[PDB]
DNA sequence: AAAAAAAAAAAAAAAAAAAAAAATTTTTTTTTTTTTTTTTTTTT
């Protein structure tokens, strides 16, 4: 304490009266002298023995961890700790136990704890408000089906897609009334979640003079975010299931739609009324949320946009390891022998795939008048239902950050972009988002894409063609984002290649649609004696049976720093490239050439240049683009 | 599922001192209040008070305001200041008290019953001049010589009342003590759904279930002593209440302590509301004593020593001692089983010249004996020397004037000047004076009142 | 007895020093003589510039920019008496500052709790404006239990009854009849905004919400409009918002309930006066500003033009190449398509609509179709369009069902009357909208464009209210070919599968073929490569984007003649097309495509600004349309 | 409003004591038609009444 | 024979009609109890 307030703490919930029993808080084991001394000692003396200088980023490992993160906390100057609950469960296990069972109280504990050690330390430093505590990573609740109501009230730890969060809600806390006989002032504060209006005035003790004045009074912020979860223990028979989480104060806005996140927070149940005048209540209870921690890091997918804006995310040792893989010789079969393990030999494909992966460079374009410009690609799998293009897009999927699925007619143009709903908790008739504009800023992996009826096939030209999305109707009048990649998958006619049909009837997709796509691979069948042999024992060791962390790093780490520019070897290159790419498409039979297809040309080149940290797109990155869109589209045969 | 309403449940509290405090501080003032001297023996004087008059099936105590101060300093300022509540506080605290000191007690007395605790002070009394406005809902004492108390009226403390249509009731009321009425709720609270309600004033004072304790309403006086010269006596009502009901009587002169308080019957000379002192305690102007007296016949001279004893300032005369002794003790009645009555008293005449102490000595005998009484031949000033029964006019019931003979029944009537008075009363003493009851039979009743006095009779 | 707001009024003192004693560069008091003509009826308040507040004194700007809400009612008397000390005004008249040029800004993201009651300026795309109101401010009760008036109470965005009867001993807070005459309002209008397409997170939503213009401030914003707001962030009282309980306030009185009347259930809630507290942040807008303003303000624009922008567009007008010169600053990026160039400048330009002594609404917008062959910049073009102009409204296909295409209605929240929601039709109100896929529109659509093109006008008529909406809008049209490739061996009405009258009513039509000729082919791959290698150079706009776009809204007001000369060319030109159509073109010649020449002729005289159409233009426009019209290909 | 008898006990009757007895009610056929104006009768421009 | 377009069906949301639901003490009358006054009947 050096004069810097205790912060309110909307997310704790409304204060309890903190009635004290002998034998501690009634009913509740904590002794709160008890947890405060034993969350200082976790605080000093806690060296996590097992941790990678990976995970821990510019924090001297043997120091006390959480004092250089009280370190930080100081230059910096956010008032929050982000403290993990398998730390706190590894040191001690009854305090755990207290910080699982009853958060309500052990959170500012904690927070007392906190600000005691940070000026013992530091008194000298200036805070905007005393520290938070946040706790997360909490035993994964797998099923929130299976949260019985004897965990109300609980710390809960959930993993889900963010696909709806309300505007902002006001939240009162200081109620300021003003006498309107005298004009004299008062403040009360949220006492109990109720305003206990003072009822006469204090200075010429008139009864009921005293009005409460709105925009006067301080208020907090609160957010209704609507997750669906995606456990990883699904029942038989179970549907998936959305949920309610409120976020308070700097919470707000921090995780929009389509974000995939693991969410830390203390697990609420509160009554409905039965009408929304009266006050009855039914005895049936819904839940959801109060949301403490989020936490959008997850080792089985890339870093999201924010994670690539933030600059201290690698050591000194780990970005000079990238940089010496980039000084590798094959550094792009490495990473494409990387992707999908489980998936034989489509080394084209896989490339395709990793180049979609890394995009290209986001070119502002405000200024030229030319408009918004796809920077990124779209890919087309095309193949009879034998090939594993539907393994491919399942793995782009699971392994993409703001991945979204779709396949065949199971699907419609309505819903792929946007509808009007009366949600459920408000009644109000807010909009809801599809998948196109969910996976905003990752990649859409449609499925069966010949099986796409004209109407919600027609929406994908938008989409592909100008990043923006437009939805108008009764319901709003706008213009969204869509700057999502495409990975389809389609089939032949009659789901099969036959052989006397050449490629474009064969395919048979609308023209135009082929020409937005940026790569057309045909997974014919190769009748290769030796490649059967191969792909046989390369299953049956599938049953029998780079890192995912540096494929990671590298991506994010181009996607962060390296924006190439376009060398004059590179654009002489791809000037002749597209010529030739004309030339030979004079038999039309295949799929003819496009000023579309040059451009596709110029992001495989920045692909290919992000992939080597190039910096500067040159023309070995213009041969690769050139050589991977004739093999994919097979132009040779 | 819907077709059930089930009690709330609450439980016991865990966790300018709140009334729940001062009642707790009552509660210890019983409980712990020690009297007996350690070198006397200690005693808790109000827990055995309790416990005997519980026991005794009594539901009232007399608990000292200079014991309450002497144990509290502050629960005697409030009481003195704010009477009321802080009095509801002490009963309850007696109540409480009381469980506890007979918790264990037989079947048939179950329930509880309610604690009056009577307070009673030392402290010198104001005057009824000086009971002005601001002296007013504070606990004021005061002399008086009270005239007129009415009859014992049975008055609700708690009450219940049904519904008229859905035959509800709102079971055990609590009735504002005092002269203060209460308003009938207005709205059948019972709400059904679906069905239409209740009329708009549905409540009857169901009579059965009720809660009712007595009530007297009493006329208290000016002393006539304390009324200045040229002035007309100041008056007071008083509410005397459950125990406070024929502790006293018209005529007695009274000390009492109360509320100075007002009527409140509803909002219905402005602005003056009729007032009274709901009182609360009230005072009225062994074997040692045994065993003495039993000495006192154990005496050789117990004759002697009882004759001096009756006339030390009467000179001479020792022969009248011995008589007037023997008069004072009487002797002693018997009834045959023949049915009749034989008298005990013993009746002396003094015939003497106008000089000796005949009217002193009868003024002694009327001192000197339990129940004395004085009177003329021709009654006392405004007091008749026999009794007489009138029919009233309004209520026709039989008012009794007592005079002298049946005012002091089994004692002592000093008639001086017996050769003067009236033909009427001659008659009636005539047989007042060997049957020792007198019959009047008036147009309404026959009655036989009982005047068992003996006549110590003076004349010239 | 009477607690003043010390730092309030200190406020109030110092800025009417700011306002008495602040002088322009020129030396005089701007605050006084823009002060005096707030004395004019319609008019009550002042505009007061920020930076002003800041030179004079930066403690007080500081002080209004951290306690704007409070401050606010006492700069307005202090106006007050800035005014009413020099000159005689009604007593009456109420008055309001509006500040500007606010150094700072944030974002309908950044408009979180911790600006309520402080000032703020976002920028926004105004979606929807609901009708001009009067709105109660001070109002004037009568309690119905004494009758005793209650005067001058407050309302804080809600209809606010007195809390207590002024008189002591009578305790009516509920039977309050109000006394208009007495009371005060403020003219008001509610405006709904959105987040501007730039600060868009990822996956999100537009955010909207709503901005309260109060008096003076209150017609300026319009539906469409890409508008600064200044002010504060508000919160306006909401009940029943939630079906879950909430805060809620209640008096601290400790009554309990007697026997009987027990404070329980209905009868508790309304004894004790509990009453949720659900807000919703409303912004309450002080002023508002276009965010690119045109100008720094054809007579009354001319006087509007400030003395380097009059000079430029004068001699942007006698130059002489300007034809090619706007086609090149339009179109940068693009190579050839030199018609396509011309047909969407005049376009944007537009004809003269006129109008017959019978009534008949003669056309005077000029619509375009692009058609042709995969990637070949149609799309870009429209977005060109687009991007470029001010009322240029996109739309792509299918992607606009009929009602937000043209027209929708919702009922006013507050009042009883409708708003009809403005579609794109209207937004491209005297402008232009690019349907992109235009073959690809439902027949229920089209024919409702197709309306729009013949009258200039929808009339909707629909779930409670009916109007006339007016929309005299210019369409440019992409359309795919049939088989997705144009096919030069047949006719374009069979090519394509518009209904044959909405065919008649395009005005151009330009056909796009891909052709694969290496000398193009080159320039093209030299083109696009050469723009993503130098992005921001490698731009020779002549005139630049701002000098073009005034130049268009400085010239659409100007409306040429045909002089006799001029007609007699119209005429005989016509009958040599006539006489070319009379071999066959791939769309047949009528009538129509004679008033076609006429628009176009007049749009080039518009282009020039001038007050004649000559053979210049006549023979360009001809020359337009025979180009466009192609010989059918039969081998 | 309040029942007429003078002599329904010691108290009085209650505040809006009659509740209609239905089957002791006499009643008819009624319908609601809804007339619009003559088609030949409506003037030109107009609607229907 | 399969694709595209149109029509009908299913389901959610909104606007008005008409039947239900809720609130809701105070002033005047008048019987009964008590006292008081004039007279007649009875007693000293
Ligand atoms: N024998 C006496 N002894 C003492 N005092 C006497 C005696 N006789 C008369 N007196 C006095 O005379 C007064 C009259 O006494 P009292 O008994 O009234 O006389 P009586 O009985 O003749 O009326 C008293 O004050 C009393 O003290
Ligand atoms: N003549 C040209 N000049 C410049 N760019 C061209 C030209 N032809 C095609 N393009 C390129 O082709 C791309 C797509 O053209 P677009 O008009 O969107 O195709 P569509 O007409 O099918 O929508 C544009 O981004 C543009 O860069
Ligand atoms: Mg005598
Ligand atoms: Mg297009
Ligand atoms: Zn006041
Ligand atoms: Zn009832
Ligand atoms: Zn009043």
Not at chain 1, 134 to 153: G, H, Q, S, V
């Amino acid at each position: 304490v050096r004069g810097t307030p205790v912060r309110q703490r909307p997310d704790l919930g409304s204060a309890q009266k903190g009635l004290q029993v002998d034998l501690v808080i009634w009913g509740t084991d904590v002794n709160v002298a008890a947890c405060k001394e034993n969350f200082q000692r976790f605080l000093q003396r806690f060296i996590d023995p097992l941790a990678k200088e990976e995970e821990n980023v510019g924090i001297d490992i043997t120091e006390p961890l959480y004092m250089q993160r009280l370190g930080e906390i100081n230059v910096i100057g956010e008032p929050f700790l982000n403290v993990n609950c398998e730390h706190i469960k590894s040191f001690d296990k009854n305090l755990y136990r207290q910080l699982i069972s009853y958060p309500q109280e052990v959170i500012p504990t904690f927070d007392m704890a906190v600000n005691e050690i940070f000026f013992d330390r530091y008194p000298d430093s200036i805070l905007e408000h005393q520290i938070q505590v946040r706790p997360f990573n909490a035993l994964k609740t797998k099923n929130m089906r299976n949260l019985n109501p004897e965990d109300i009230d609980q710390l809960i730890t959930i993993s889900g897609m963010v696909i709806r969060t309300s505007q902002l809600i006001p939240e009162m806390q200081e109620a300021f009334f003003q006498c309107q006989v005298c004009a004299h002032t008062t403040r009360v504060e949220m006492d109990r979640g109720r305003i206990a209006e003072p009822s006469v005035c204090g200075r010429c003790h008139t009864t009921h003079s005293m009005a409460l004045i709105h925009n006067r009074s301080l208020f907090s912020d609160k957010q209704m975010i609507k997750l669906q979860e995606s456990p990883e223990d699904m029942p038989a028979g179970q549907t998936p299931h959305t949920v309610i989480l409120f976020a308070h104060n700097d919470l707000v806005d921090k995780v929009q739609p389509g974000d995939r996140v693991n969410v830390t927070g203390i697990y609420r149940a509160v009554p409905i009324r039965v009408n929304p005048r009266v006050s009855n209540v039914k005895s049936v209870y819904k839940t959801h949320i109060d949301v403490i921690h989020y936490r959008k890091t997850d080792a089985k997918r890339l870093h999201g946009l924010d994670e690539e804006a933030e600059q201290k995310l690698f050591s000194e040792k780990r970005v000079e390891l990238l940089k010496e893989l980039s000084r590798k010789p094959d550094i792009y079969e490495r990473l494409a022998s990387a992707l999908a393990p489980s998936i034989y030999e489509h080394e084209d494909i896989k490339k395709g795939i990793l180049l979609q992966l890394f995009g290209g460079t986001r070119k502002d374009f405000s200024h030229t008048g030319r408009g918004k410009f796809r920077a990124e690609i779209n890919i087309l799998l095309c193949g009879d239902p034998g090939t594993s293009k539907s393994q491919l897009l399942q793995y782009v999927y699971n392994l993409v950050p703001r991945g979204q699925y779709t396949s065949g007619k199971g699907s419609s143009a309505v819903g792929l972009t946007a509808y009007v709903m009366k949600d459920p908790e408000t009644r109000q008739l807010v909009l809801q988002t599809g998948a196109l504009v969910l996976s905003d800023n990752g990649i859409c992996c449609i499925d069966e894409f010949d099986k796409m009826n004209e109407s919600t096939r027609s929406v994908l030209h938008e989409v592909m063609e100008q990043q923006t999305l437009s939805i108008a109707k009764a319901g709003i009048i706008c213009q969204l984002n869509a700057r999502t990649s495409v990975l389809a998958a389609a089939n032949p006619i009659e789901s099969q290649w036959n052989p006397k049909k050449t490629t474009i009837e064969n395919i048979q997709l609308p023209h135009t649609l082929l020409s937005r796509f940026d790569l057309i691979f045909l997974m014919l069948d190769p009748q290769d004696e030796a490649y059967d042999r191969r792909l046989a024992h390369h299953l049956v060791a599938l049953y029998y049976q780079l890192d995912m962390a540096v494929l990671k790093d590298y991506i994010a780490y181009a996607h962060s720093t390296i924006m190439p520019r376009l060398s004059e070897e590179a654009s002489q290159a791809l000037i002749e490239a597209y010529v030739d790419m004309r030339k030979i498409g004079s038999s039309r039979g295949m799929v003819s050439a496009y000023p579309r297809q040059l451009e596709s040309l110029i992001r495989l080149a920045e692909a290919h240049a992000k992939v080597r940290l190039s910096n500067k797109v040159e023309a070995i990155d213009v041969e690769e683009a050139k050589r991977l869109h004739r093999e994919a589209l097979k132009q040779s045969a | 599922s819907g077709f059930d309403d089930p009690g709330i449940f609450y439980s016991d509290s865990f966790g300018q001192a709140r009334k729940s405090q001062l009642q707790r501080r009552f509660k210890e003032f019983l409980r712990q209040y020690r009297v007996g001297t350690d070198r006397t023996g200690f005693t808790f004087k109000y827990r055995d008070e309790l416990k005997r008059h519980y026991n005794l099936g009594e539901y009232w105590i007399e608990v000292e305001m200079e014991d309450l101060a002497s144990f509290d300093e502050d629960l005697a300022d409030y009481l003195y200041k704010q009477p009321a509540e802080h009095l509801q506080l002490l009963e309850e605290a007696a109540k409480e008290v009381a469980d506890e000191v007979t918790r264990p007690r037989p079947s048939g007395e179950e329930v509880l019953q309610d604690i009056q605790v009577m307070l009673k002070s030392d402290a010198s009394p104001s005057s009824i001049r000086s009971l002005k406005s601001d002296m007013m809902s504070h606990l004021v004492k005061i002399p008086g010589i009270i005239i007129a108390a009415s009859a014992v009226r049975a008055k609700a403390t708690r009450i219940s009342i049904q519904c008229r249509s859905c035959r509800n009731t709102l079971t055990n009321i609590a009735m504002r003590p005092g002269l203060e009425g209460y308003a009938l709720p207005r709205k059948c609270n019972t709400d059904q759904a679906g069905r239409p309600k209740c009329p708009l004033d549905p409540y009857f004072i169901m009579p059965d279930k009720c809660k009712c304790v007595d009530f007297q309403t009493l006329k208290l006086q000016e002393l006539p002593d304390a009324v200045p010269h040229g002035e007309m006596p100041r008056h007071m009502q008083l509410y005397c209440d459950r125990y406070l009901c024929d502790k006293v009587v018209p005529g007695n002169r009274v000390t009492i302590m109360g509320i100075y308080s007002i009527k409140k019957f509803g909002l219905t000379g402005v602005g003056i509301r009729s007032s009274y002192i709901r009182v609360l305690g009230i005072q009225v102007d062994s074997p040692q004593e045994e065993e003495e007296f039993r000495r006192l016949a154990a005496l050789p001279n117990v004759y002697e020593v009882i004759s001096k004893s009756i006339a030390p300032s009467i000179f001479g005369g020792t022969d009248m001692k011995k008589a007037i002794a023997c008069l004072l003790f009487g002797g002693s009645r018997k009834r045959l089983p023949d049915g009749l009555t034989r008298r005990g008293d013993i009746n002396l005449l003094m015939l003497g010249d106008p000089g000796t102490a005949k009217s002193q000595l009868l003024k002694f005998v009327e001192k000197c004996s339990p129940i004395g009484v004085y009177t003329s031949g021709k009654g006392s000033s405004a007091a008749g020397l026999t009794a007489s029964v009138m029919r009233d006019p309004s209520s026709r019931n039989f008012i009794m004037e007592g005079g002298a003979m049946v005012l002091a029944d089994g004692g002592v009537v000093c008639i001086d000047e017996f050769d003067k008075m009236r033909e009427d009363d001659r008659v009636a003493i005539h047989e007042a004076m060997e049957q020792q009851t007198i019959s009047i039979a008036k147009a309404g009743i026959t009655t036989t009142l009982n005047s068992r006095c003996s006549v110590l009779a003076a004349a010239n | 007895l009477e607690v003043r707001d010390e730092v309030a009024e200190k406020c109030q003192k110092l800025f009417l020093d700011f306002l008495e004693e602040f002088q322009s560069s020129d030396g005089e008091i701007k605050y006084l003589q823009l002060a005096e003509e707030l004395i004019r009826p319609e008019r009550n308040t002042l505009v007061v510039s920020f930076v002003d507040l800041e030179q004079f004194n930066q403690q007080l700007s500081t002080t209004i920019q951290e306690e704007f809400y409070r401050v606010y009612p006492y700069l307005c008397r202090a106006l007050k008496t800035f005014v009413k000390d020099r000159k005689e005004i009604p007593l009456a008249k109420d008055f309001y500052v509006a500040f500007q040029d606010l150094p700072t800004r944030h974002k309908i993201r950044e408009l979180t709790s911790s600006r309520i009651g402080l000032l703020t300026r976002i920028s926004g795309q105004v979606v929807r404006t609901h009708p001009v109101h009067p709105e109660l401010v001070s109002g004037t009760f009568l309690c119905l239990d004494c009758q005793t008036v209650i005067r001058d109470v407050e309302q804080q965005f809600k209809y606010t009854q007195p809390n207590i009867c002024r008189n002591p001993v009578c305790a009516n807070r509920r039977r309050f009849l109000l006394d208009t005459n007495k009371s005060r309002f403020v003219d008001f209008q509610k405006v709904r905004i959105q987040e501007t397409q730039a600060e868009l997170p990822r996956g999100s939503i537009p955010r909207s919400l709503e901005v309260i213009l109060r008096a003076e401030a209150v017609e300026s914003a319009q539906a469409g409009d890409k508008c600064d707001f200044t002010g504060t962030l508000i919160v306006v009282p909401d009940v029943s918002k939630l079906s879950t309980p909430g805060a809620r306030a209640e008096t601290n009185s400790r009554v309990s309930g007697v026997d009987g009347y027990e404070t329980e259930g209905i009868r508790g809630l309304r004894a004790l006066g509990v009453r949720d507290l659900s807000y919703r942040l409303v912004f309450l807008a002080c002023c508002v500003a276009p965010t690119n303003p045109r100008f720094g303000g054809a007579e009354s624009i001319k006087n509007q033009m400030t003395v380097k922008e009059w000079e430029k567009v004068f001699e942007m007008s006698q130059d002489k190449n300007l034809y090619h010169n706007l086609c090149t600053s339009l179109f940068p990026t693009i190579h050839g398509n030199d018609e396509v160039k011309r047909g969407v400048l005049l376009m944007l330009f537009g004809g003269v609509p006129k109008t017959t002594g019978e009534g008949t609404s003669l056309r005077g917008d000029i619509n375009v179709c692009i058609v042709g062959d995969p990637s070949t910049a149609k799309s870009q073009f429209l977005k060109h369009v687009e991007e470029f102009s001010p009322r240029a409204v996109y739309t792509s296909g299918k992607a606009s069902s009929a009602a937000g295409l043209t027209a929708a209605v919702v009922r006013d929240e507050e009042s009883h009357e409708f708003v009809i929601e403005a579609g794109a039709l209207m937004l491209a109100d005297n402008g232009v909208c690019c349907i992109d896929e235009f073959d690809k529109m439902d027949v229920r659509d089209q024919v409702a464009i197709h309306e729009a093109m013949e009258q200039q006008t929808i009339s909707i008529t629909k779930a409670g209210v009916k109007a006339t909406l007016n929309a005299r809008t210019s369409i440019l049209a992409a359309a795919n070919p049939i088989s997705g490739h144009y096919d030069r061996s047949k006719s374009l009405k069979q090519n394509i599968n518009l209904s044959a009258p909405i065919m008649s009513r395009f005005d151009l039509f330009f056909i796009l073929v891909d052709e694969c000729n290496e000398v193009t082919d080159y320039a093209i791959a030299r083109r696009i490569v050469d723009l993503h290698s130098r992005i921001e150079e490698s731009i020779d706009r002549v005139y630049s984007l701002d000098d073009i776009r005034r130049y268009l809204l400085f010239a659409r007001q100007f409306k040429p003649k045909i002089s006799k000369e001029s007609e007699d060319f119209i005429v005989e030109q016509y009958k040599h097309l006539r006489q070319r159509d009379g071999t066959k073109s791939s769309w047949r010649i009528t009538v129509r495509q004679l008033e076609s020449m006429i628009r176009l002729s007049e749009a080039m005289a518009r282009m020039h600004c001038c007050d004649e159409v000559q053979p210049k233009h006549v023979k360009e426009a001809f020359r337009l349309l025979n180009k466009s019209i192609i010989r059918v290909e039969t081998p």
